[PDB]
Each structure stands twice: as structure tokens, then as C-alpha cells.
Write an enzyme that holds these catalytic residues in place. Structure first.
Site, PDB file in Angstrom:
ATOM      1  N   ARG A 160       0.805  -1.223   0.000  1.00  0.00           N
ATOM      2  CA  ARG A 160       0.000   0.000   0.000  1.00  0.00           C
ATOM      3  C   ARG A 160       0.843   1.280   0.000  1.00  0.00           C
ATOM      4  O   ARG A 160       0.326   2.369  -0.257  1.00  0.00           O
ATOM      5  CB  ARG A 160      -0.967  -0.045   1.201  1.00  0.00           C
ATOM      6  CG  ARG A 160      -2.061   1.002   1.323  1.00  0.00           C
ATOM      7  CD  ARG A 160      -2.479   1.171   2.780  1.00  0.00           C
ATOM      8  NE  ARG A 160      -3.168  -0.005   3.305  1.00  0.00           N
ATOM      9  CZ  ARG A 160      -2.617  -0.884   4.134  1.00  0.00           C
ATOM     10  NH1 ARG A 160      -1.362  -0.723   4.526  1.00  0.00           N
ATOM     11  NH2 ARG A 160      -3.313  -1.926   4.560  1.00  0.00           N
ATOM     12  N   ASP A 161       2.156   1.171   0.212  1.00  0.00           N
ATOM     13  CA  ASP A 161       2.996   2.352   0.382  1.00  0.00           C
ATOM     14  C   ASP A 161       4.321   2.202  -0.345  1.00  0.00           C
ATOM     15  O   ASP A 161       5.360   2.628   0.171  1.00  0.00           O
ATOM     16  CB  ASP A 161       3.277   2.636   1.863  1.00  0.00           C
ATOM     17  CG  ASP A 161       2.016   2.758   2.693  1.00  0.00           C
ATOM     18  OD1 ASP A 161       1.628   3.895   3.022  1.00  0.00           O
ATOM     19  OD2 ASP A 161       1.419   1.714   3.027  1.00  0.00           O
ATOM     20  N   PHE A 162       4.314   1.595  -1.528  1.00  0.00           N
ATOM     21  CA  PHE A 162       5.557   1.215  -2.183  1.00  0.00           C
ATOM     22  C   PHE A 162       6.215   2.468  -2.750  1.00  0.00           C
ATOM     23  O   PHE A 162       5.573   3.242  -3.466  1.00  0.00           O
ATOM     24  CB  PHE A 162       5.289   0.200  -3.285  1.00  0.00           C
ATOM     25  CG  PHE A 162       6.468  -0.674  -3.605  1.00  0.00           C
ATOM     26  CD1 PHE A 162       6.628  -1.890  -2.959  1.00  0.00           C
ATOM     27  CD2 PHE A 162       7.446  -0.263  -4.489  1.00  0.00           C
ATOM     28  CE1 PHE A 162       7.706  -2.707  -3.235  1.00  0.00           C
ATOM     29  CE2 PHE A 162       8.525  -1.072  -4.772  1.00  0.00           C
ATOM     30  CZ  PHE A 162       8.657  -2.292  -4.137  1.00  0.00           C
TER      31      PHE A 162
END
Lengths: 174, 327, 816
Positions: A47-49
């Protein structure tokens, strides 16, 4: 604070000539951690790459750490995000492997998606033709560059149905 | 009560931003009473509710022998955010300056004894447009859809060009376009705009923002706002109208239906006899199917990923007026 | 400047001597033998004023003469509202009668040789070169001489950083160098350089990126493909860096063809310090003796289109322009001064010697421009000679509105009138004379051409600051001043009550609000004689009804105006016992729940303006009882047995401008529909039908006929679908201007045109933002044979018009 992020090393000013072909092995270790962090469990989507979400340990190890309608977009503030994520919002593994493909483009290229035209919009035209990077003088002779670029083009598909899984992309890189 | 200090403080900052925008040269705002507006709304929750959004709830109401459309603001969702209060007063003052058009929702005044200035507008008869069409107990014809299209278009051109310093509001949805008795499309809530300063047509909006699905992903990945950041999302404000399919579309499985992707693949797969909101298809389809084809090719042309191929709002409004020529 | 105070004193005594109420009183005999020797003083006080210059012995006492005139004026206005034993003034009058003449006798040889200006009536609009565009042909000639030189450097040095940069955009998009020519770059290099937009900006129009890179490789990248081809370079805001670094840039670009760089700076490090192709550094601020003198005639004469019909005066004009050696606004100021007389050569030579002796002892580059215009200043008519110097009470380049300073003028009495021409026909007259004399210049017009906002220049505002300094007028850093003006957070020292204090005006740089506390509101009414008061663009933290409830003790008020001020819920209850209060204006103020009845109980006021105020109880009853209302706009005719009406305004005659809103059925009344046919001098009406639901309103307003004479018609919301069936040449012959703002109307009925033998004979037309109109432009021509221009900006379905996009962007379309 082990080494800072990859942007502390890949996108740092001056010149910072970092390594030879070991950052590919750092990427293999990162995806090798990511595979059982996000697939072998019940279900986990990262979700936060982000390059600033990929770090470096003392032996140059990329251990990922520390990760409802919102009108302000926070997830993927730049070209890390996905064209299907712009439409639906459903966080899948296709978005994770898409951001994995663009960080492969960062670690083989050394460019980000800012305007002075962006990363995919320049590299995916620029296709033999491995004269894209000049930060290293010995940038070519790792010899797996064109097959790694073909792997990245296979990861960067606009459709989500010919999606490369994060498991099967690992053993194609070694 | 402390209604008086409510009135004094918010009227102070309202006048300050009013003169800071347009020199203190307003439009004749009138004032309403708390008792008048509470007897209009009947204590804020009934079938008199019409539309929800993040900050505001669009109600109906009735002052003495005159119904009205009313907008309050969320007291809980705003007051802890300086950028939100700086936003909402920009909303009310820019709408108040925007009353000088007949395609915008005319402002009629505001009451100020509240935490936040609930404000009245001109009474449009029909309710808020939903993500397909009308919302009262009924479907609506085709020519009124074209009129809604052209009036949304020239209203957004007014927002783009009508000043020395230009403004951009980053979202045009069919949840906003209110609709009167005589079937005009009065747009409202000019309420996510920024005024970018003089001359330059490109500024770094430090918050990418506004109604997921209509984002123009080049702006989403580059975090600065252009002229074209509205001319994208007007296209899938037109496509939503002419296909009747909401933006977050699902078919029994995890809403993976990108609207642009579906119409773009159906452009070369289904060949355009499938995109016309099929319950409408008791239409006579005499020559207006060709203008359907013209507006869908306009919409897919105005939304591609290379921005210099996109026309401006002036061009899309001009040829959207031009496709009236079936008459 | 005391010629103004003696003139307003003489007119005040001439008006107040005809009261005929108190006879057994020696002061009513004393006023005549004040007036007579004041007329004797007016023989030579002009030479006394210009002899006050460069002679300290005159200003030691004439200021005491001036304050003597001021206190005599104050006690004679104190004699007006007396209503009792006003006999304690005669011994004081004897005292300053004995005080006057020891100033009268020592001035016996310093000369030893009528407040109505005559030239203020024709306004001439002498901004014919203002907006400097007369340099395009010579700049194009400078473009044409690139190859004749080696490498042209077009240094527009001197003035810079001020807004002159638009002199080169017509060169950027002309006709001759866009066909056989390649292209031209543009830079935006201000005082910041950042080492990124200097030399990379001239390449990034081809695709140069913002990569960390040295100077050398891009310097050998840009300037290569230029073998015998004309090309243009630009630069902006140079200093030592990019002059000791640019020397390899501009000599690194090739030669043998020309190559024109244009540098536009305030500094002068390129035109002289290297001196390379800077033989054209002869900037248009300086001019030839036959480049400057013809436009000086265009300014000064301007009546026979700037000609010397007496060629005797050509010699003195030539000698004046060769003394000021062609610096632009100096010749503009002496041109605007030389509008009036033009009679005989000896006064022209007299004022030429007045120019001569002040330039005989200046000896600088910038005291010549300063003292050149001061002789233009003191050679005005007397009455406006102090009204020019009130706008020294402003910041440096604020854009001053007319309805503040004109109302201040006519409030504290700088404009005089006796015979019919009452208020605005005099105030706009003296302001138009002041802009004939080129001191004050227009900024914005309307469709009609009335004036709104006006600005000054810096090298005249410092002069009038100096005149304010040496005459105890303003700058209260130092208390003794004439009247005060407040801008953003500047009297936070709380500048106290002085007794001098004729008035106070708010000032603002179009975009701010000066916040102010409640204490200086008390410090206002602490004073006594505050003839003009306006706190316009200010907000308070307390309502005005409880902080301006100490006003009835004052009584010497002519002017209040509270426009754009939020805590003004109610007008003050104590507005009963005050009688002069000549003007009042709460313009655009939105929250006025009632208008107090007692304000109709004084028969003297002039302007009543409550415009665009929606929330209102919309008038008291007897508003027809006054006689001297000449502009009262924002009428709101009241309900049936409520408030005012429309029939009761028939008692008035004096109007020029009114304005009224029509919402329900019961504003107008059916027998009152013909109440405005026989008004004599009513000139320009207004209508804003904003909140209009009731469909009977369009049906029943349509016979409200105006007077046949009128000048500016402006109805602006008008909910009906057709024309109101009275706008016709059959009904109103001599209209000149017409404006329709945002309305829903469809078309107009055919008696609107009525062009058998009857035409509109108007000149300016505005159809601004109205979405359902369908007319023909040729029908408009053949129905209206006279148009200066017609503006329209947001009106679709009107593509018959001539402006290039009538739906969206306003073309003005003047007639040539």
C-alpha cells in the site's frame, strides 16, 4: 538510521557512484522478503511502495519496514502508483508489482518521474537499445540488462490480467 | 447567547476575504434569521435532506411562501484544520462573486450565528443530480442531457477564463450540478478551487485532491495543477451522463471497472452501439446517435494521457455548442 | 496655499451674511469689513505665495494669518447653529482685526502691482501618448541594423524593474520578423538568478532539462547553428555576475551577421561598462527638440489638436522645452499648466522667467524635475490649490476611488456653488479640471466613460508630501496637521485629538483592511470639528450602534460614509439632533436591519446612497419631504401602508441619479406607476431586480415611464423575458448610455426599435452577462445610427455580433 533510503544513495546529489551489479541482488533480497511478507500470509498489500520506503541495511540489505473514502490522495503521490489504481482504488498485488517494476526502472536507470515525459513515458518508448544510462561507464556489461528490461516491461503492463506474480518474477531475475 | 460573537467573528473574516477577492464590490447578499432557517430546515434531518458530501449537506427548506436550497457545513469535520477554514471561506466568497452568471447557482445570502455560515441559494425545483440523473421519485430525456453538457461546459470556461487571475476547481461531478424547474444546469459548490496567480498557468498544488476516479493521473503523479486538470475530468463528467454508469462500477466482484478503459476497449471491440445508456434506447435515434458518437469521441479525445492533444475548455464548449446542428 | 482658505472663507461669508436673523449685533456689521480687506488681500496673495518660496521671512507669519482665517471660519460656523446669545465673538473679531493689519502693512512692495475656474468644464483626455507605444518603429529600425553592426546589444538601461517590459512583446509578436526570421527566446531573470534559469532557459524552449550540469557544455550546445541568420536574444536584471560571466557567452555566440541581445534593466552595467553596440542608448525618456515639442503642444494646446495658431508663442514654447531638455512628465506638467491662459505673450514670458529663476539655482539631475512642477502647482486657480494636495494622504501607488475624495471635498467645503449647479456637476467639474492640468490621471473607465479610480506619480507625491510638511497638513508623526488619513495599522500609536483636525479619511491599497480597535472610535468623538469622516475598508470588533452612540454632541458634520464595514447592524439611535450632514453612504453594506426614521427630519442633505443592501427595512415614510436630494440610489419602494412609496418622491425635483430595487408585488402600487414622468433634471436612473420570484412584477412594472430627458439607463437584473415595453425612441429621446447586466430575458418587442422616424440617439451600450439573447448586429446598426462602442462579454446565441467571441471574451468594438 541504517543507511537512509535508496533515494539517499540513488538520487543523492554530487555524483555518488555507488556499486556495480549488486543493487540487482539488493532488489532480489527485497522482493524475496516481500513475497512472504505479502503473499504467504493470509493477505497483505503493501500500500505504500516507494523508493523512500525501501531502505538499506549495513550489508546493503533492503528490508522493508513500517508499511474509507479520502478525497486527498496520499497513496502513491508520484508515478509509483497504477493506472488501474487511479480508477478503482482496490489495492492488489498488481499495484505492488507495478511499483516494483518502476523501482526496477529507478535502479537500472537512475531517474525519477519529475518534470523540468515521465519515467514510463520515456523508458517504454526507449526500446539493442540499452544506451539509456550513463552514470556508470561500465553500465552495459552485466549482460542481463536487456532481459531485465524485458522483465520490467512485462511487469509494467497497462492491463492487470497478464500480471506477473511477485513469486515468479524472482527466479527469472537470477 | 454566543450567537453574536459567532456573527461578529465570521462576518469579520468574511468581509476580509470578500474585499481581498473583489474589492468589496459584492452582489446584494441579504441576511436571514436563525429562526427563519430552522423553520425552513425543520431541525436539519428529514426528507428535506437531498445530498451528502464531505463538508456540506444540501437541504431543501422553506421560508415564508418561498422554498429554497440550503447548504450548511460540517462543524466537526472542518474546525481542526486551518487549510479547511481557509478553503471554506474561499468557497463562500467565490460563489458569492460567482452569482453574476445565469448558469451558476445564484447566492441569496447567509446566516452567521452558527459555528459556520450556513447559506441560502436560489431555489432550484428538482433535487440534486445523482450520479446518473434525477433523484426524486420517478429517468430524464436526451436533449436535456445535451443542455446539461453545454451549460456545464461554458460554466467551466467562465471559471477558466473570466478574469485576470484564473481559478481552477479540481472536480466536476454529476453530484454537484443542480437543476431548476425550467431544466437548466446550475452548477454549484465552487468549493475546491485554487486561484493561481497572475500570468503563470502552472503551479505546484501541494495537496493532490478531489473525488477519486476523476483525477487525471498525470496530475496525480506529477503533483502540480494545470489548465487541463479540469478538461480531463469534465470528460468523465460527460461520459457518466451519457452512459448512466457510475464511476466506481462493480460487477459482483471487487469494483475493477475503469470507465475509460471499458469505453476505450469497446471503441474497437463493440463498435459504439453499446455505450448509449441502454434504458434510454427507446429513443428515436434518428440522427442524434451520430451526435452521441461525436460527444463520445470528444470525451475520449479530451482524456488521453498526452495533455497537449487535449483541447481547452473553450474548444470543447464551442464544439459542444456546435453539435446542436441536428436541428 | 492660503489662497484656497481665503477663497472658501469669502464664499462662506457671502453665503452666511444673508441669514437676516440677528440684526442688533456689531459682528453682522464686522463681516463686511472683514470681506472688504480680504478682497484687498486677494489682490496680491498669489505673489505673496510664490514669494514665500526662497524667502523665510514671509512664512513666519502667513501661517498665523492662515490659522486666523481658519479659526474665524470655525467661529462663524459656530454662529450659524447658535439659537441664542451669540454675542461673545465680537471682541475676538476686533482682536484679530487688530492682528491682521501688522501683516498687511509690511507686504507693501513685495508685489506692488472669483473662486470659479473657467477651463474645468471641457475635459480633454490628454493620455494620448501615455501608454507609451510610439517607439515601435525605431525599435524595429534597431532590429534592422543588426548586420550593419557586429553584435547588437540593446540595453534599455536606466528605468527598470517598474513594468516597462511590455515594450518588447509587440516586438515579440510583430509582422516582419515572423516570416523570414527563425524565432526569438525569452528569459525571466529578475534580481534572483538561481544558476538554473539563466542560460538553460534559452535552451529549454527546445527541450533542455533541469539536470545538474556545468556552464560549459550548454554554452557550446546552444549558440552554434547561426551562420548568417538573423536571431534575437533577451536578458533582464544584470549585475556584476552575468557581466563578468556573460562576456564569454555573448562573445561565444558567433558574429559576422549581427545578433541582437536586448537587455532591460534598472542598472547600467552593460550600456557603458563594456560599451559594445550601445550607440542606441538614447532612451525615449529623452527626446529630440522635434520629438518632444510636438507632443508638448498636443498636451498644452489640445483644442485645435495641438497647434500653435499664434506662432509667436512657438518661441517661448521652444525655449521652455529646451530648458527642461525633454524629460517626459515635466513637459506634461507644464503642458497641463499651460492649458488655461494662451492669451498674450507677456504672461507666457512672465511664467517663463518664473521657470528661469527657479532653474537658475538648482544644479542637479532630479531637482529640476521636482521644482519644475511646483511652479505649475502654485499657478492654479485658488479654490482647487488645496484640494489637489489632499491625495498626499495616501500610500505610494494606491488606486484612489472617486467616491471617497470627491465626497470628502464636497463634505468639508472645498467646492462652492450658488446658482443651480449644485453638487456633482461641480465636484466632478473641479476634479475634471484637476485632471486637465495633468496632475491626476485616469486608470479605469466604464462603458459610459465616467471616471472611477485615479492614481498619482511618485515624483509628484513626494512634492505634495513636502508641501504638506511645510504647511502643517498631514503626516501626524508630529501632531500639528490639518486633517488625517488612516491606512493599515498606522495609528497604533493612537494619534490623539488635536483641535485643528478638520477631518479624517480611510485609505487602502485595493486589497487590504485596516483593522482597528474600539479606543480610537472614542478618540474620534473626543474631537469637535470633524466635517468629513469615512472609515470604509475597515472591520471592527464591536458593533457601531454602541460605539458610535456619542455623535449627537458634535453637530459639525457634513460627511459620514460607512461602506464595506461589517459590525453596522443598526444605524445609531442618537441621529436626531444634527442638521447639516450633507452626504451619507453605506455602499455595499449588507447587514442593516432598519433605516432610522429621524434621518428624514433634516432638510439639507444631498447624497443618500444605500446601494446593493439586501437586508433592509427599505425606507422610513416621509422621504419626499426633503428638497435637495440630487443622488439617492438604493430606493427600495416600501409596502402598501408601510414606509415610503413611489408617489411621494414626486415632491422632489432636484434629482440626478436614483436607484431602486423591485422584488415583490407591493413595492410598487398601481396608481403610483406614473409618478416619474415630470421630473426636470433627473439624469441617470438604476434598477436591480435581484430577488424576483413574483411573475406579476414584469406584468405591472412595464408602464413605469421615466422622464423623457435622461442620460444613463441601467437596469441590471430584470426577471422578465421581454423588454419592459417602454424603452423606445418614442418615449425617451436624449439617452446617451444604456446598460443591461445579468438577466434572463429572451427578446424585445418591436416598439423597442420603432425606427420609422424615431431613433435612439444613444452612444454607448453594454450587454454583459445574459444568456438568452438573440438579435442582429445589422439590426442594431440600422436602428441606432450613433455608437461610440458597445461592449458585451458573456452572451451566447449572439454570433451575429462583430467581437471575435461574443459568448466568452469581450471585444469593445469602438467605431473608428
Amino acid at each position: 538510521m541504517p543507511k537512509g533510503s535508496l533515494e539517499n544513495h540513488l538520487f543523492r546529489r554530487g555524483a555518488q557512484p555507488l556499486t556495480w551489479a549488486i543493487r540487482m541482488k539488493v532488489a532480489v533480497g527485497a522482493a524475496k522478503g516481500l513475497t512472504f511478507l505479502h503473499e504467504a500470509k493470509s493477505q497483505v498489500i503493501y500500500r505504500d511502495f516507494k523508493a523512500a520506503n525501501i531502505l538499506l541495511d549495513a550489508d546493503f540489505n533492503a528490508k522493508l519496514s513500517d508499511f474509507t473514502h479520502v478525497s486527498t490522495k496520499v497513496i502513491g503521490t508520484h508515478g509509483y502508483a497504477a493506472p488501474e489504481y487511479v480508477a478503482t482504488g482496490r489495492l492488489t498485488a498488481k499495484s505492488d508489482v507495478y511499483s516494483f517494476g518502476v523501482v526496477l526502472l529507478e535502479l537500472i536507470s537512475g531517474r525519477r518521474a519529475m518534470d523540468n515525459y515521465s519515467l514510463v513515458d520515456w523508458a517504454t518508448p526507449y526500446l539493442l537499445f540499452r544506451i539509456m544510462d550513463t552514470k556508470l561507464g561500465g553500465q552495459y556489461p552485466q549482460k542481463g540488462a536487456f532481459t531485465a528490461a524485458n522483465l520490467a516491461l512485462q511487469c509494467l503492463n497497462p492491463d492487470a490480467k497478464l500480471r506477473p506474480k511477485m513469486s515468479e518474477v524472482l527466479v527469472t531475475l537470477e | 447567547d454566543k450567537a453574536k460573537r459567532w456573527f461578529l467573528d465570521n462576518g469579520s473574516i468574511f468581509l476580509r476575504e470578500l474585499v481581498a477577492d473583489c474589492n468589496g464590490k459584492s452582489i446584494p447578499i441579504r441576511s436571514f434569521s436563525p429562526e427563519q432557517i430552522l423553520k425552513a430546515t425543520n431541525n436539519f434531518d428529514s426528507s428535506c435532506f437531498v445530498s451528502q458530501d464531505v463538508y456540506y449537506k444540501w437541504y431543501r427548506g422553506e421560508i415564508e411562501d418561498r422554498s429554497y436550497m440550503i447548504k450548511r457545513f460540517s462543524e466537526d469535520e472542518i474546525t481542526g484544520k486551518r487549510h479547511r477554514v481557509k478553503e471554506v471561506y474561499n468557497d463562500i466568497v467565490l460563489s458569492a462573486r460567482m452569482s453574476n452568471h445565469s448558469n451558476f447557482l445564484q447566492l441569496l445570502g447567509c446566516c452567521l450565528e452558527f459555528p459556520f455560515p450556513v447559506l441560502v441559494f436560489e431555489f432550484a425545483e428538482h433535487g440534486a443530480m445523482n450520479q446518473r440523473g434525477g433523484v426524486i421519485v420517478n429517468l430524464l430525456p436526451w436533449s436535456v442531457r445535451l443542455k446539461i453538457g453545454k451549460e456545464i461546459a461554458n460554466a467551466v470556461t467562465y471559471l477558466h477564463t473570466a478574469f485576470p487571475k484564473i481559478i481552477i476547481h479540481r472536480d466536476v461531478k454529476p453530484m454537484h450540478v443542480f437543476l431548476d424547474k425550467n431544466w437548466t444546469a446550475k452548477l454549484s459548490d465552487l468549493s475546491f478551487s485554487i486561484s493561481l496567480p497572475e500570468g503563470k498557468s502552472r503551479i505546484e498544488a501541494e495537496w493532490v485532491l478531489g473525488t477519486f476516479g476523476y483525477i487525471d493521473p498525470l496530475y496525480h503523479k506529477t503533483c502540480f495543477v494545470t489548465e487541463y486538470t479540469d478538461v480531463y475530468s469534465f470528460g468523465i463528467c460527460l461520459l457518466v451522463i451519457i452512459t448512466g454508469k457510475p464511476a466506481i462500477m462493480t460487477i459482483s466482484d471487487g469494483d475493477l471497472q475503469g470507465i475509460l478503459s471499458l469505453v476505450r476497449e469497446l471503441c474497437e471491440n463493440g463498435k459504439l452501439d453499446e455505450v448509449i445508456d441502454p434504458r434510454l434506447m427507446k429513443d428515436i435515434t434518428s440522427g442524434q446517435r451520430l451526435q452521441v458518437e461525436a460527444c463520445v469521441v470528444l470525451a475520449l479525445r479530451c482524456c488521453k494521457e498526452r495533455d497537449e492533444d487535449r483541447p481547452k475548455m473553450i474548444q470543447v464548449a464551442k464544439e459542444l455548442k456546435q453539435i446542436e446542428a441536428s436541428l | 496655499m492660503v489662497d484656497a482658505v481665503v477663497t472658501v472663507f469669502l464664499e462662506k461669508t457671502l453665503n452666511i451674511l444673508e441669514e437676516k436673523g440677528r440684526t442688533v449685533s456689531d459682528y453682522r456689521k464686522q463681516l463686511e469689513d472683514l470681506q472688504s480687506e480680504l478682497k484687498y488681500m486677494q489682490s496680491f496673495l498669489k505673489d505673496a505665495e510664490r514669494q514665500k518660496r526662497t524667502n523665510e521671512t514671509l512664512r513666519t507669519l502667513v501661517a498665523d494669518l492662515r490659522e486666523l482665517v481658519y479659526e474665524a471660519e470655525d467661529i462663524l460656523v459656530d454662529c450659524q447653529l447658535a439659537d441664542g446669545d451669540d454675542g461673545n465673538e465680537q471682541r475676538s473679531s476686533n482682536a484679530w482685526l487688530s492682528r491682521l493689519h501688522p501683516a498687511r502693512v509690511p507686504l507693501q512692495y513685495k508685489k506692488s502691482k472669483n473662486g470659479t475656474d473657467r477651463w474645468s468644464s471641457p475635459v480633454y483626455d490628454h493620455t494620448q501618448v501615455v501608454g507609451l507605444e510610439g517607439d515601435k518603429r525605431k525599435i524595429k529600425e534597431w532590429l534592422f541594423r543588426s548586420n550593419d553592426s557586429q553584435l547588437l546589444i540593446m540595453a534599455f538601461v536606466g528605468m527598470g524593474g517598474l513594468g516597462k517590459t511590455t515594450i518588447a512583446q509587440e516586438v515579440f509578436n510583430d509582422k516582419e520578423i515572423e516570416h523570414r526570421f527563425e524565432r526569438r527566446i525569452w528569459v525571466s531573470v529578475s534580481q534572483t538568478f538561481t544558476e538554473e534559469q539563466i542560460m538553460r532557459s534559452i535552451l529549454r524552449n527546445l527541450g533542455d532539462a533541469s539536470v545538474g550540469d556545468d556552464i560549459g557544455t550548454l554554452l557550446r550546445k546552444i549558440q552554434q547553428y547561426l551562420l548568417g541568420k538573423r536571431y534575437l536574444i533577451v536578458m533582464d536584471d544584470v549585475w556584476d555576475k552575468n557581466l563578468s560571466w556573460w562576456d564569454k557567452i555573448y562573445q561565444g555566440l558567433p558574429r559576422g551577421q549581427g545578433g541582437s541581445v536586448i537587455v532591460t534593466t534598472r542598472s547600467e552595467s552593460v550600456a557603458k561598462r563594456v560599451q559594445a553596440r550601445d550607440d542606441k542608448t538614447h532612451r525615449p525618456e529623452l527626446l529630440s527638440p522635434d520629438n518632444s515639442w510636438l507632443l508638448f503642444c498636443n498636451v498644452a494646446f489640445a483644442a485645435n489638436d495641438g497647434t500653435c495658431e499664434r506662432p509667436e508663442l512657438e518661441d517661448v514654447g521652444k525655449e521652455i522645452v529646451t530648458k527642461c531638455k525633454g524629460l517626459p512628465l515635466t513637459i506634461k506638467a507644464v503642458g497641463g499648466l499651460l492649458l488655461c491662459k494662451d492669451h498674450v505673450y507677456h504672461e507666457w514670458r512672465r511664467i517663463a522667467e518664473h521657470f528661469q529663476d527657479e532653474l537658475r539655482g538648482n544644479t542637479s539631475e532630479t531637482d529640476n524635475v521636482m521644482s519644475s512642477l511646483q511652479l505649475s502647482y502654485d499657478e492654479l486657480p485658488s479654490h482647487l490649490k488645496s484640494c489637489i494636495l489632499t491625495l498626499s494622504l495616501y500610500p505610494e501607488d494606491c488606486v484612489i476611488p472617486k467616491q471617497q475624495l470627491v465626497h470628502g471635498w464636497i463634505g468639508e467645503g472645498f467646492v462652492m456653488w450658488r446658482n443651480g449647479r449644485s453638487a456633482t456637476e461641480s465636484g466632478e467639474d473641479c476634479f475634471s479640471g484637476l485632471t486637465n492640468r495633468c496632475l491626476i490621471e485616469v486608470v479605469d473607465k466604464t462603458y459610459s466613460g465616467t471616471i472611477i479610480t485615479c492614481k498619482i506619480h511618485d515624483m509628484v507625491r513626494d512634492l505634495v508630501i513636502d508641501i504638506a510638511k511645510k504647511d502643517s497638513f498631514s503626516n501626524p508623526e508630529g501632531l500639528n496637521c490639518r486633517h488625517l488619513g488612516i491606512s493599515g495599522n498606522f495609528d497604533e500609536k493612537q494619534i490623539k485629538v488635536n483641535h485643528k483636525l478638520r477631518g479624517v479619511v480611510s485609505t487602502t491599497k485595493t486589497g487590504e483592511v485596516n483593522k482597528l480597535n474600539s479606543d480610537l472610535a472614542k478618540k474620534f468623538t473626543d474631537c469637535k470639528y470633524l466635517r468629513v469622516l469615512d472609515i470604509s475598508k475597515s472591520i471592527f470588533d464591536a458593533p457601531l450602534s454602541e460605539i458610535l452612540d456619542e455623535i449627537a454632541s458634535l453637530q459639525h458634520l457634513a460627511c459620514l460614509s460607512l461602506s464595506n464595514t461589517h459590525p453596522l447592524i443598526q444605524f445609531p439611535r442618537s441621529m436626531e439632533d444634527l442638521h447639516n450632514l450633507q452626504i451619507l453612504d453605506a455602499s455595499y453594506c449588507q447587514n442593516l436591519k432598519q433605516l432610522q426614521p429621524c434621518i428624514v427630519l433634516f432638510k439639507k442633505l444631498l447624497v443618500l446612497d444605500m446601494t446593493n443592501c439586501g437586508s433592509l427595512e427599505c425606507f422610513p415614510k416621509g422621504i419626499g419631504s426633503l428638497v435637495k436630494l440630487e443622488v439617492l440610489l438604493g430606493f427600495k419602494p416600501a409596502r402598501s401602508n408601510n414606509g415610503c412609496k413611489l408617489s411621494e418622491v414626486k415632491n422632489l425635483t432636484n434629482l440626478r441619479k436614483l436607484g431602486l430595487s423591485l422584488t415583490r408585488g407591493d413595492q410598487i402600487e398601481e396608481e403610483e406607476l406614473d409618478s416619474l414622468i415630470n421630473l426636470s433634471k433627473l439624469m441617470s436612473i438604476s434598477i436591480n431586480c435581484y430577488d424576483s420570484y413574483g411573475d406579476d412584477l414584469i406584468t405591472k412594472i412595464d408602464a413605469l415611464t421615466p422622464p423623457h430627458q435622461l442620460h444613463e439607463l441601467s437596469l441590471q437584473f430584470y426577471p422578465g423575458k421581454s423588454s419592459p415595453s417602454w424603452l423606445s425612441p418614442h418615449k425617451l429621446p436624449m439617452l446617451r448610455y444604456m446598460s443591461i447586466c445579468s438577466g434572463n430575458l429572451v427578446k424585445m418587442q418591436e416598439p423597442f426599435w420603432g425606427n420609422e422616424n424615431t431613433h435612439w440617439r444613444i452612444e454607448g451600450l453594454m450587454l454583459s452577462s445574459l444568456s438568452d439573447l438573440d438579435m442582429d448586429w445589422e439590426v442594431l446598426q440600422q436602428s441606432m445610427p450613433y455608437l461610440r462602442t458597445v461592449t458585451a462579454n458573456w452572451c451566447p446565441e449572439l454570433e451575429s455580433f462583430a467581437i471575435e467571441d461574443v459568448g466568452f471574451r469581450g471585444g469593445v468594438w469602438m467605431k473608428t
